[PDB]
Amino acid sequence: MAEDADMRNELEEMQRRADQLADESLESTRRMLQLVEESK
Amino acid sequence: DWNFEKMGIGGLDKEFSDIFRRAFASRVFPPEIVEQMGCKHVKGILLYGPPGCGKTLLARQIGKMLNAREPKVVNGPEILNKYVGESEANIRKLFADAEEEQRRLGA
Amino acid sequence: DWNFEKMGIGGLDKEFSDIFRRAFASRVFPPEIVEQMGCKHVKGILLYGPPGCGKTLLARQIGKMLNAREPKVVNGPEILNKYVGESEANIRKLFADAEEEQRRLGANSGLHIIIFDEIDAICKQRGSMAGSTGVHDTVVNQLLSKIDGVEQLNNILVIGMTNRPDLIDEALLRPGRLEVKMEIGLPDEKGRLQILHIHTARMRGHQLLSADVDIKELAVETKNFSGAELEGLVRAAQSTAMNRHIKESLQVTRGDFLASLENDIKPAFGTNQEDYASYIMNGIIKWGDPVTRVLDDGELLVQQTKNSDRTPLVSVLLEGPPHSGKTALAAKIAEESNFPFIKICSPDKMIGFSETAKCQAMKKIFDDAYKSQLSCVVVDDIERLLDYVPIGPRFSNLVLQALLVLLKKAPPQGR
Amino acid sequence: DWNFEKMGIGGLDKEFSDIFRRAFASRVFPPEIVEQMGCKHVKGILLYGPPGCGKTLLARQIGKMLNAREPKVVNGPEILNKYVGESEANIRKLFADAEEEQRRLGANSGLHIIIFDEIDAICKQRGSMAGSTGVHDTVVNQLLSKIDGVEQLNNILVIGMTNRPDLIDEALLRPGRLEVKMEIGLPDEKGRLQILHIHTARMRGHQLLSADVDIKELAVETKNFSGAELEGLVRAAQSTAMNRHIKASTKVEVDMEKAESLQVTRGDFLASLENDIKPAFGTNQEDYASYIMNGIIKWGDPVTRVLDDGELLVQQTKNSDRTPLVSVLLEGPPHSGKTALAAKIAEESNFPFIKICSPDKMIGFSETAKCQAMKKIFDDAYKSQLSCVVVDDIERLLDYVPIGPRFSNLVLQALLVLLKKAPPQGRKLLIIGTTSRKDVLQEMEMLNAFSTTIHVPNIATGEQLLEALELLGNFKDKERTTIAQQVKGKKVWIGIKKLLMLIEMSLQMDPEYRVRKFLALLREEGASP
Amino acid sequence: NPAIFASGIIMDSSISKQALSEIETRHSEIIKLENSIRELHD
Ligand SMILES: Nc1ncnc2c1ncn2[C@@H]1O[C@H](COP(=O)(O)OP(=O)(O)OP(=O)(O)O)[C@@H](O)[C@H]1O
Numbered sequence A: 001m002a003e004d005a006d007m008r009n010e011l012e013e014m015q016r017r018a019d020q021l022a023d024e025s026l027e028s029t030r031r032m033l034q035l036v037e038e039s040k
Numbered sequence B: 001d002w003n004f005e006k007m008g009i010g011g012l013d014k015e016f017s018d019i020f021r022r023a024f025a026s027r028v029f030p031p032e033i034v035e036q037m038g039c040k041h042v043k044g045i046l047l048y049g050p051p052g053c054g055k056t057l058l059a060r061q062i063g064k065m066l067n068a069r070e071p072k073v074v075n076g077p078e079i080l081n082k083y084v085g086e087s088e089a090n091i092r093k094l095f096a097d098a099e100e101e102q103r104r105l106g107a
Numbered sequence C: 001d002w003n004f005e006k007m008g009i010g011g012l013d014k015e016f017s018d019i020f021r022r023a024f025a026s027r028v029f030p031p032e033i034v035e036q037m038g039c040k041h042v043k044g045i046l047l048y049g050p051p052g053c054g055k056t057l058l059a060r061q062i063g064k065m066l067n068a069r070e071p072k073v074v075n076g077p078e079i080l081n082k083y084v085g086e087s088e089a090n091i092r093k094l095f096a097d098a099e100e101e102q103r104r105l106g107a108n109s110g111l112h113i114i115i116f117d118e119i120d121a122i123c124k125q126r127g128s129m130a131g132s133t134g135v136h137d138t139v140v141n142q143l144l145s146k147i148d149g150v151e152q153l154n155n156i157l158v159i160g161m162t163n164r165p166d167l168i169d170e171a172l173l174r175p176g177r178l179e180v181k182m183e184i185g186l187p188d189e190k191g192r193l194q195i196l197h198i199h200t201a202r203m204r205g206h207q208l209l210s211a212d213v214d215i216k217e218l219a220v221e222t223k224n225f226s227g228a229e230l231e232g233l234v235r236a237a238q239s240t241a242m243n244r245h246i247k248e249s250l251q252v253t254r255g256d257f258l259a260s261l262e263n264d265i266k267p268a269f270g271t272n273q274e275d276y277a278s279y280i281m282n283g284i285i286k287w288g289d290p291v292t293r294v295l296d297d298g299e300l301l302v303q304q305t306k307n308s309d310r311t312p313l314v315s316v317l318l319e320g321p322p323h324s325g326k327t328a329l330a331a332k333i334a335e336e337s338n339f340p341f342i343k344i345c346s347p348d349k350m351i352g353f354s355e356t357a358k359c360q361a362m363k364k365i366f367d368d369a370y371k372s373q374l375s376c377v378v379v380d381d382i383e384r385l386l387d388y389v390p391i392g393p394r395f396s397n398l399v400l401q402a403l404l405v406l407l408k409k410a411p412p413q414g415r
Numbered sequence D: 001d002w003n004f005e006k007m008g009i010g011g012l013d014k015e016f017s018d019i020f021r022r023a024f025a026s027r028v029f030p031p032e033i034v035e036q037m038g039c040k041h042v043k044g045i046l047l048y049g050p051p052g053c054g055k056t057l058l059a060r061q062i063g064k065m066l067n068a069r070e071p072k073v074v075n076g077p078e079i080l081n082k083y084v085g086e087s088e089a090n091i092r093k094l095f096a097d098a099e100e101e102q103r104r105l106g107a108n109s110g111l112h113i114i115i116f117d118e119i120d121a122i123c124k125q126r127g128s129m130a131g132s133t134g135v136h137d138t139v140v141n142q143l144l145s146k147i148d149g150v151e152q153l154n155n156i157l158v159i160g161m162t163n164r165p166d167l168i169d170e171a172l173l174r175p176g177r178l179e180v181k182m183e184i185g186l187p188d189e190k191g192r193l194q195i196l197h198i199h200t201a202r203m204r205g206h207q208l209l210s211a212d213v214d215i216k217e218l219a220v221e222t223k224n225f226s227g228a229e230l231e232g233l234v235r236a237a238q239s240t241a242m243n244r245h246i247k248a249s250t251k252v253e254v255d256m257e258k259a260e261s262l263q264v265t266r267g268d269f270l271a272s273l274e275n276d277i278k279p280a281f282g283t284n285q286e287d288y289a290s291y292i293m294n295g296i297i298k299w300g301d302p303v304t305r306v307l308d309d310g311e312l313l314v315q316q317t318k319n320s321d322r323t324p325l326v327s328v329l330l331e332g333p334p335h336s337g338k339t340a341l342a343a344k345i346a347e348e349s350n351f352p353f354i355k356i357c358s359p360d361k362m363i364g365f366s367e368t369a370k371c372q373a374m375k376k377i378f379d380d381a382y383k384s385q386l387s388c389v390v391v392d393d394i395e396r397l398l399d400y401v402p403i404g405p406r407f408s409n410l411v412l413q414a415l416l417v418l419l420k421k422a423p424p425q426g427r428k429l430l431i432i433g434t435t436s437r438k439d440v441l442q443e444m445e446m447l448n449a450f451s452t453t454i455h456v457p458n459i460a461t462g463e464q465l466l467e468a469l470e471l472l473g474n475f476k477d478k479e480r481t482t483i484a485q486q487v488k489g490k491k492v493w494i495g496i497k498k499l500l501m502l503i504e505m506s507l508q509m510d511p512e513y514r515v516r517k518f519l520a521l522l523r524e525e526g527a528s529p
Numbered sequence E: 001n002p003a004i005f006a007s008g009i010i011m012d013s014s015i016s017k018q019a020l021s022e023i024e025t026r027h028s029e030i031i032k033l034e035n036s037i038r039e040l041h042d
């Protein structure tokens, strides 16, 4: 089980990676909209 | 320390002295002379008698006497399992800590 | 830095010599001459014998003698598993490194070792049994295919251990497979002397062994002592000597050896002294000539069975009216025999047994009797063994046939 | 570059010729003619036989000879897996490349080989365990459907090797899937000669073989040695020869300068034969030394007559053709020494396979086991060109006891049916049985099965007793004269096996009391002729 | 005799595969676009 346990733990770390990537993209889009609004 | 009575067992006068003499005489003697002699330590003992006469109590008291770690009580009928390679796995789980600790800490 | 003296093995000179001759004699000769003969290498060894005679020790010493890598160990049936197709995977994982190294290097590879322990718990005969439990057939087939298959391996060595050489499959004991079979038996006087010298060397070095103890005497006072009981004797002597210093000048004296020999160690193939105390309850009383006549006849029979070479097996029946005292006289004759191995097979220890259990018990006693240079076996109160009762009559046929077959079977050569 | 002699297989000419004719004959003939015939190709071979005869070697050599793709291999049950539906995909993964290449390159494709090893581990009879074990019914179906299904393949070749040809599924051996079936058996003299030459050529090349070693004598000497045991013999001889030059193996390993002058002499071969290698279908000298424990001595006329009658029966079974199975019953009173005579007859027959079926090795067995062990010993004897099987103590084999009477019926039926089963065409067999009670066997209707009977007598005259004593020579001249004076004018009734024990018992008294004790014992025994 | 095997069936499929999926490569381009329009606004 140690093999499966450790690999699933790396998978959980990878879930955190995915969450960070998605949140970063969302924040980038929000700042995107802010600047685009500002120029006008 | 022997003091068979202080420990909480009465009536075991000879069945304690013989055990102490034969089995545990190489655990308390100064290590230098034991190493110089080059004698190994006994690896177990057997106790048989009528039920309800004070066996398990003696085992626990012996364990507490030598500053040993917590004993792993096991019941004979409970180890059997009906799949292939389950009883052996249970019998082989009890000897993990000893192997690991010897491999790590040496002698 | 290897030399035989440091191995710590005694009494097994010829067996080790033969193992070395047949297994390792071609891995140390110059490679140039080896290649001009084109001879492959032996791929297995097998060791069997009674308990406590020095098999695992020999395997360990062989393992750590060579310049090889760490030997893999299999501790009995630790490869079995409950999911279909997992046991064979565990079997196949043992040989992977050898195959990889062979493919990479060729004839220049090192050596590998695998050590099975209690091999008879896996490799049973592949009989039909109306379809065996796959546990046997699949594992055995995988092992057979891996040891010697289509692809060639030439850098492995497999050792085995077992107490029952009968149960193992025959296709697994042919040349090209585990082909070096050795039997480890009880030692004779020289073996006991060598073992005692090996196990009491450190004490002599530091001047802890008294000057009165003579090893040559202990080599004679212990008969049919296995390898694993002499160490117990020595350890008991040391413990008895040490306990005397609990309420710098410590020493071990003869009295400790005598006490430990008389009270602590009980050999399994030796003579027992409580049986005679239990069966001869009130001694023997001389109330007439017949007692002397019977004892003299017993003495003559004993001398004959000891001194002859055309009559290696003897028998005698003591019979008379009831309440006459037959068992006591038989026990007295056996005690006066002065044989290294004496036994009694009485019916009061088989209370409630069926036929087959009695057959197995008798066979086990005689099998042990067949492993000593001398012996003596007493079968008393036969009519109880046969289960006789006048109404009918009724009795057991299997036991009678077993006894009739065993009463005229000769022991191995020379015994 | 293929050449047959390079193959390195000896004693299997006919099998290889048949395989070549049936399998590779249609892939070498010019294609234009082969097209005019419209014949498909064979896609299967099966090999079976006893252990150690040269199956895997033949498979490997066939694999190497073909200028084609590298063969795939499957070691036993290597395909099984623990996930539902994953133990079959491994079957389908073996034919994918062949399918794709057949689709692409049409009828000019190459040849793809496959080698199943120990095929009786995954291809047992269907419906044998109430639908099998769940995973031994899908694999078989997948294999059957893939080898020959709706879609046609024409560029594969499957090989199988097995020790037990009885358990393979029947639907898998029809003439469309595994057509060629071959049995690899023990060799005869020429095969042993060829094998020894093949395995000694290299040594003889470099002058490492002595000049006093003659191969023909070794070929004649080893009877019914399997293929691997000759190689084992040669290897043991080489190792024994090499062990001479390691002087200090006990202290430290050292090699001499005389290693250059290394040669293997016949003494090594003789020692290896005597000590190391022991065959399986042959014979060894331990059993004879265990049964004939005190030799055989001519104490009268009857012994020569018995031996002559045995020789006549042996000659008949060797030469005749109408009768391939003959049997004989040796009978006489107890303690007459009959099993030794049977052993002597069998030993002087000089047949290749000679085995003794005795109750010494069936202690505690039930009826089912006695029956099955008897069957195995009688099956091993059908795989040799000549044989001789000895049955001992037919009375003890049935568990006969005068009370009741009581005995076993299944074993008796097995025996009565097993004395009339002729061997496979072209082989001969001789059965000898010994018993001590003829009338009991008569009452069971068992003397009709045996062909002829021989009688074994006791000592029945003073002169014969004196001759036996002289041959043994335990009593010297004066005591012999006293014994003669005492017994020469009477009749005696005693067996040899009892005479030996009487002599041994008598010898234990004082030097001046032996003769009187011996006479007392001889009088006590009693005659009751 | 007490000797029988078992076979497993897997209920295993969850949050999308490891970063071999397109999530990271998808994330990559947004920052470049951000750079571009930051330039334009400044
Ligand atoms: N020939 C010998 N020379 C010296 N010491 C020996 C000899 N044989 C046994 N011993 C001692 O007795 C011990 C016996 O343990 P060992 O592992 O050899 O037993 P075994 O008979 O192989 O085991 P088992 O019957 O459990 O399979 C050895 O470790 C060693 O201490």
Ligand SMILES: Nc1ncnc2c1ncn2[C@@H]1O[C@H](COP(=O)(O)OP(=O)(O)OP(=O)(O)O)[C@@H](O)[C@H]1O
Binding pocket: C280, C281, C282, C283, C284, C285, C286, C291, C322, C323, C324, C325, C326, C327, C328, C329
């Ligand atoms: N000379 C003697 N011979 C035999 N037994 C003797 C003699 N003197 C004393 N005894 C005592 O007689 C008893 C022997 O009885 P034992 O058990 O041998 O009888 P048994 O013949 O086996 O009995 P049964 O067959 O009737 O059950 C023992 O107590 C033994 O000490």
Ligand SMILES: Nc1ncnc2c1ncn2[C@@H]1O[C@H](COP(=O)(O)OP(=O)(O)OP(=O)(O)O)[C@@H](O)[C@H]1O
Binding pocket: C171, C176, D008, D009, D010, D011, D012, D050, D051, D052, D053, D054, D055, D056, D057, D058, D195, D198, D227, D228, D231
């Ligand atoms: N006809 C032969 N000529 C030469 N050597 C042979 C012959 N038959 C067998 N051998 C020797 O036998 C060795 C092993 O035999 P092989 O691999 O054919 O065993 P097998 O009987 O097919 O296997 P198994 O019965 O164990 O499944 C080969 O390396 C070769 O040395």
Ligand SMILES: Nc1ncnc2c1ncn2[C@@H]1O[C@H](COP(=O)(O)OP(=O)(O)OP(=O)(O)O)[C@@H](O)[C@H]1O
Binding pocket: D291, D292, D293, D294, D295, D296, D297, D298, D299, D303, D333, D334, D335, D336, D337, D338, D339, D340, D341, D436, D496, D497
């Ligand atoms: N001419 C002879 N014929 C037979 N046996 C002989 C002869 N000379 C010596 N012997 C010895 O006599 C013994 C024969 O005993 P054997 O085993 O044949 O007994 P048996 O007749 O089968 O016994 P039982 O009927 O009690 O089962 C063997 O030791 C054999 O060596």
Ligand SMILES: Nc1ncnc2c1ncn2[C@@H]1O[C@H](COP(=O)(O)OP(=O)(O)O)[C@@H](O)[C@H]1O
Binding pocket: B008, B009, B010, B011, B012, B050, B051, B052, B053, B054, B055, B056, B057
């Ligand atoms: N020698 C003794 N002195 C005092 N109490 C005892 C003694 N032997 C047994 N006992 C009592 O018996 C109780 C249970 O004993 P237990 O360990 O169950 O024995 P067993 O091993 O036979 O089960 C203990 O709690 C203890 O109080």
